Design an enzyme around this catalytic site. Structure first.
Site, PDB file in Angstrom:
ATOM      1  N   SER A   1      19.023 -43.940  13.048  1.00 25.69           N
ATOM      2  CA  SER A   1      19.409 -43.614  13.857  1.00 25.69           C
ATOM      3  C   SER A   1      20.188 -44.864  15.305  1.00 25.69           C
ATOM      4  CB  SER A   1      18.185 -42.301  15.000  1.00 25.69           C
ATOM      5  OG  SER A   1      18.967 -41.565  15.865  1.00 25.69           O
TER       6      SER A   1
ATOM      7  N   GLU B   1      22.897 -33.000  10.041  1.00 25.98           N
ATOM      8  CA  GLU B   1      23.068 -34.403  11.127  1.00 25.98           C
ATOM      9  C   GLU B   1      23.022 -33.406  13.063  1.00 25.98           C
ATOM     10  OE1 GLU B   1      22.652 -37.702  10.864  1.00 25.98           O
ATOM     11  OE2 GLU B   1      22.874 -37.808   9.121  1.00 25.98           O
TER      12      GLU B   1
ATOM     13  N   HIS C   1      18.012 -34.487  10.568  1.00 23.47           N
ATOM     14  CA  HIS C   1      17.990 -35.849  11.568  1.00 23.47           C
ATOM     15  C   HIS C   1      16.515 -35.994  11.758  1.00 23.47           C
ATOM     16  CE1 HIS C   1      20.110 -38.871  13.791  1.00 23.47           C
ATOM     17  NE2 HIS C   1      19.047 -39.181  14.279  1.00 23.47           N
TER      18      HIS C   1
END
Ligand code: I1X
Ligand code: I1X
Ligand code: NAG
Ligand code: NAG
Ligand code: NAG
Ligand code: NAG
Lengths: 533, 537
Positions: free
Chosen positions: B203, B328, B441
């Site tokens: 990320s 995600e 995610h």
């Protein structure tokens, strides 16, 4: 002389001719005048009903074809000629044709009325493809087809003038429908069961009769094959009609409204048709010079407004398209295409081509079209670009207008049946890459394969009979389904909820959902927002 | 020294360290926890770039994790492993620039390839000490040297008055660069190969790796890069100098501090909690996946916008592993989009889907917002609550990760990079979030680091074998620039993502399956069309 061929209508007496269909004779009455010849000071004006006549009028030949442009793109080639007129050209063209069983039907039998296509710029009811003998002989139906004025003669309009008020080509159609009320019963036909059915500009016309209150008294069911009153090609506004008309006049020397139209009236017909194709605003394909006009009269508002608010609680409609609507028109404009090679095209050509196919599109909206139809797994593939370019043209001009119409009619109370025609003719003469082009379901609806000498294949004969019965069942009942067949393939109503249509091909009926639903959302819902911003 | 373990005493450029002998499932590992690499950036050093850690006398004890950079603490679901596992697990302090090192035990006799981890956390949270960043398993099982550093987050890392000496911004990245410099100078002492250094990060961390690819000073401190579920390009990773300037002066106004020097100086006199208590308050629009203080395009660390740099730079001498999880978007919805919660099935209405889009895509004009809804809608079922929920997750996920990633992979590839791309499709049996969220995610990380090898953690035997396969993939890529096994051609091979074939692999309990088209059609929407729609409005 044969009493079956002798009929009295309100205007005189008619001698028809007995024709052989593959498995029986039929009575045909060809060339019946339904209006006074629209020549001279009648040019550009609403038709007037036919004066009575003396004696027995001969109705055994097809009459002359309305005056119109004649294609020359492929001189001699059968796939273009088959649409060209097969009788002499004349402004004196307001005649209709009637086929009926032999003998004349005992009980009253449903009527089917056919409005040809040809972009409101060409066409004729005398084409071999519109032969009414098979529907009459096989399905016991009574079939009427008419000529209507096309081109400048049918649709040139100086709106709000008396001498050329627009839409007279449609009014030609409307008189033939009044004639069928006043006269069809004499042939055995039922004036209380009349189905209109037409293809392309014909289907657009049929639609416009749904949307004009004076026509609703004259029919009960409608069939719209591959065309719509809505969409980008079928209507102009009053402002744009006035512009194309005043330009055509300048282009032929003329010269006030009255002075302007009067001079046009003193012009040999070919002098007007020579410049027809020359008044279009932008470069185009699937865009026609003279077409119906939003006049506040025949069309009280635009077809988009009208389908969006009308109440169609009584209506029954059968709409559909072919597998490859846009492929025909690509050879008539888009560089790279041609019937003779494979029309594999480059990305450059596909970008250029979209500006033609969507002439009204801005820069931003034409990139929105290229980004949608591009297969981003194979963005340079000549085969996908070709097939996509055709998809753009077919979807913008036909498939998504049909999808919007079917949506609104069903939502506003009508019973809609929707189809997609997926069988290509074995007889066909265009290359393979066009697939099933715009207009090649017609020969199957008119039953042409049943003639043994047309060299159609056996299952094509069986296919033709299935369609002939879908339509005539619709005409009888407003439902294409046989009321005596209990074989599971049933044709469901199209709805807004389930959006189900069926596929017409050699395999049995198959029910599908969504008529290019994601792709029509793009055309019908988003691009309107995009151009107006 | 005397009776100390003689494999846990190591000298670095700053002095001597006493490490610790950790048990891993298959044997012990050496761990050096809390090594200082910068002067603690407190007092007058707040917002300033880091200074290299002045050397210490004596033997420094490096057996526990050090402090966490000062940060906002999530309080959405209090006492729930889903959120807690990311929450900081040490004392919060501005004094926080420490790094950690895991190595085999004994330390290797050959020079071992190095892996450096950079944590995600939206540039506003995160710590190298979280249990899921545990290097004990990579080090023991694949024989690798793992390094993970703390970098300053939030205002303390990224608040910027661009052009100023007192707060030049991007110092959070300059922390990471110092630790990379540190690994160059000292990693040999641990058996690491300073000529085989692989950054890898998830990320915001994946974003960070990208900034280092794009910044010339960082390019000599590493050789390969893995970006997990994040990119330097994209909507959330960077801000213009203008926006950073605005967000900073408003945060000043918000805490009492109305020339940049005097302003920053006042901010320096402010309790760390005062700043944390107000950072969520300077976002322009009601958003999700938008973070107040992030890297700024300063013309220094980043010479131009990321989007510009990947379009135009040369990357032949580059190997990259990129990829994304399946869902995600789903995690972020329950922190903003009305209708979503971890406790029910989050079945939203078409009304809520339009409201959501305006939040998930907060820079979108009315027309663009409409285009998104037009595209993600199922026009056979435009009011279907299950389809609408999943579409809303897919809007956040594609806008913010999968299409920056797809653009990054495509752009790097076209310019000489060797690119490998994956989609992570396995949901952990131990997942505590609800089933509708899919593979959220962040939940491939525990499998790269090897946590399922810990018997106490209650994974499946297949999850164990699965996690082993991934550790091989990642480290093979570190070792060779290629996740494939040299001594194994029977098992399926993972081809490079090229522009011409856009090939990528699934990572799930089944063998590798090669796929074409990284959300090809929908990323044309976001990476090609929508910039033009914003452009002409
Ligand atoms: C005069 C003409 C000729 C071909 C077309 C056309 O687009 N055909 C397909 C259209 C016209 N027209 O403008 O009437
Ligand atoms: C100060 C803060 C706090 C929570 C967020 C945020 O987006 N949380 C949800 C993501 C998981 C974001 C911020 N921020 O913008 O700095
Ligand atoms: C096909 O033929 C036409 C005219 O002969 C030509 O303009 C076109 O470029 C040709 N297309 C290909 C793909 O060769
Ligand atoms: C059909 O084919 C036969 C020969 O196979 C030929 O004699 C006949 O004229 C053909 N008819 C048509 C309409 O093509
Ligand atoms: C789920 O719960 C939240 C809060 O408890 C609520 O706002 C939301 O509307 C709920 N969703 C559904 C589909 O019931
Ligand atoms: C794992 O399972 C055991 C056996 O039920 C249980 O006692 C333990 O608390 C579980 N731990 C975790 C972290 O799930």
């Amino acid at each position: 002389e044969d009493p079956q061929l002798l009929v009295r209508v309100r205007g005189g007496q008619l001698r028809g001719i007995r024709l052989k269909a593959p498995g029986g004779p039929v009575s045909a009455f060809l060339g019946i005048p339904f209006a006074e010849p629209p020549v001279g000071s009648r040019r550009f004006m609403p038709p007037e009903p036919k004066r009575p006549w003396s004696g027995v009028l001969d109705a055994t030949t097809f009459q002359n074809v309305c005056y119109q442009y004649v294609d020359t793109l492929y001189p001699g080639f059968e796939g273009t000629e088959m649409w060209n007129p097969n009788r002499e050209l004349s402004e004196d063209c307001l005649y209709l044709n009637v086929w009926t069983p032999y003998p004349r039907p005992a009980s009253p039998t449903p009527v089917l009325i056919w409005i040809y296509g040809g972009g409101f710029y060409s066409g004729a009811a005398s084409l071999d493809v519109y032969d009414g003998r098979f529907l009459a002989q096989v399905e016991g139906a009574v079939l009427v087809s008419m000529n209507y004025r096309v081109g400048t003669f049918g649709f040139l309009a100086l709106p709000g003038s008396r001498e050329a008020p627009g839409n007279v080509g449609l009014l030609d159609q409307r008189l033939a429908l009044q004639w069928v009320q006043e006269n069809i019963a004499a042939f055995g036909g039922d004036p209380m069961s009349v189905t209109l059915f037409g293809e392309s500009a014909g289907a657009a016309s049929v639609g416009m009769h749904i949307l004009s209150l004076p026509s609703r008294s004259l029919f009960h069911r409608a069939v719209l094959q591959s065309g719509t009153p809505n969409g980008p090609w079928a209507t102009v506004s009053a402002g744009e009609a006035r512009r194309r008309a005043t330009l055509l006049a300048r282009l032929v020397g003329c010269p006030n409204d009255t002075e302007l139209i009067a001079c046009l009236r003193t012009r040999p017909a070919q002098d007007l048709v020579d410049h027809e194709w020359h008044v279009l605003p932008q470069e185009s394909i699937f865009r026609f010079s003279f077409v119906p006009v939003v006049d506040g009269d025949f069309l009280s508002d635009t077809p988009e407004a009208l389908i969006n608010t009308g109440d169609f609680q009584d209506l029954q409609v059968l709409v559909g398209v072919v597998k490859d609507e846009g492929s025909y028109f690509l050879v008539y404009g888009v560089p790279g295409f041609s019937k003779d090679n494979e029309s594999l095209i480059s990305r450059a050509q596909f970008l250029a081509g979209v500006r033609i196919g969507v002439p009204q599109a801005s820069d931003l909206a034409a990139e929105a079209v290229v980004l949608h139809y591009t297969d981003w797994l194979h963005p340079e593939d000549p085969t996908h670009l070709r097939d996509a370019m055709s998809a753009v043209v077919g979807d913008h001009n036909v498939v998504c207008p049909v999808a919007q119409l079917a949506g609104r009619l069903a939502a506003q109370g009508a019973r809609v049946y929707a189809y997609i025609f997926e069988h290509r003719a074995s007889t066909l003469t265009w290359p393979l890459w066009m697939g099933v082009p715009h207009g090649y379901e017609i020969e199957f609806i008119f039953g042409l394969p049943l003639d043994p000498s047309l060299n159609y294949t056996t299952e094509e004969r069986i296919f033709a009979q299935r369609l002939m019965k879908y339509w005539t069942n619709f005409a009888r009942t407003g439902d294409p389904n046989d009321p005596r067949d209990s074989k599971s393939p049933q044709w469901p109503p199209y709805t807004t909820a389930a959006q189900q249509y069926v596929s017409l091909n050699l395999k049995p009926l198959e029910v599908r959902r969504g008529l290019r639903a994601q792709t029509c959302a793009f055309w019908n819902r988003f691009l309107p927002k995009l151009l107006s911003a």
